[PDB]
């Protein structure tokens, strides 16, 4: 099925699978502490994970994998996926991270939490990059599925599994080129932009790992509440 999709059917499929944008519990009047602001973000993240899990099932080729492999891909990629979604929502708000329609933050507020400001700056910088490139929604959904399939594929007959993932990855690459060609880009421009887009994933992996360590830090501090699902995701990375 997944390997049968045309470029357009792939785009449509991914666009149809897009999770919703959730709201936070943020009260603009309510005073902000360290434990409360991180609580809002962690509360939000926890609810996003549930939607992300069900979104993954609609990503072409994902359900073709063993349950053990699906678990692995999500355990590895979850924070990268949240982050790239955040950066995408934040594109139209220079200097701000749109965690939710009712929660728009800047680097200043990202200081009620220790060590948060570094990760925020990286997220903002990625947002700038998206803006500089004029990232398209069609390209974003491709990138997000690439993260899900690629991020854990090298840390897994159990090789027949890996082979299929690479086939689907190639399919998404074709989709990206197809998109760029439609946008009237030259063959040189297509290859250049494709590279520019994939290079971003390196910086997204980086932010995820820095953020993952920040999460473990918050957990051990035992000040901010972490959901049971979030603790298990965090545990998957050990640390």
């Amino acid at each position: 099925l997944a390997l049968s999709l045309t470029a357009d059917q792939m785009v449509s499929a991914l666009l149809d699978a897009e999770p919703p944008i959730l709201y936070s519990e943020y009260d603009p009047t309510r005073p902000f502490s360290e434990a409360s602001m991180m609580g809002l973000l962690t509360n939000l993240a926890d609810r996003e994970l549930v939607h992300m899990i069900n979104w993954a099932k609609r990503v072409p080729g994902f359900v073709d994998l063993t349950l053990h492999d699906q678990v692995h891909l999500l355990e590895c990629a979850w924070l990268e996926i949240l982050m790239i979604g955040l950066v995408w929502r934040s594109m139209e708000h220079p200097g701000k991270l749109l965690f939710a329609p009712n929660l728009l933050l800047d680097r200043n507020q990202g200081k009620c939490v220790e060590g948060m400001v570094e990760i925020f700056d990286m997220l903002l910088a990625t947002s700038s990059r998206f803006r500089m490139m004029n990232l398209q929604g069609e390209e974003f959904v491709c990138l997000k599925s690439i993260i899900l399939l690629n991020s854990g594929v090298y840390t897994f007959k159990s090789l027949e599994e890996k082979d299929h993932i690479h086939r689907v990855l190639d399919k998404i690459t074709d989709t990206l080129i197809h998109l760029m060609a439609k946008a009237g880009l030259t063959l040189q421009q297509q290859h250049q932009r494709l590279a520019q887009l994939l290079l971003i994933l390196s910086h997204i992996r980086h932010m995820s790992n820095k953020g993952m360590e920040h999460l473990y830090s918050m957990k051990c501090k035992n000040v901010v509440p972490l959901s049971d699902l979030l603790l298990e995701m965090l545990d998957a990375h050990r640390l």
Binding site: I53, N54, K57, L67, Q70, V71, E75, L229, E232, M233
Partner: peptide, 9 residues
Amino acid sequence: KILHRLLQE
């Protein structure tokens, strides 16, 4: 295993 269960259900 919460994630495992959500993936099934």
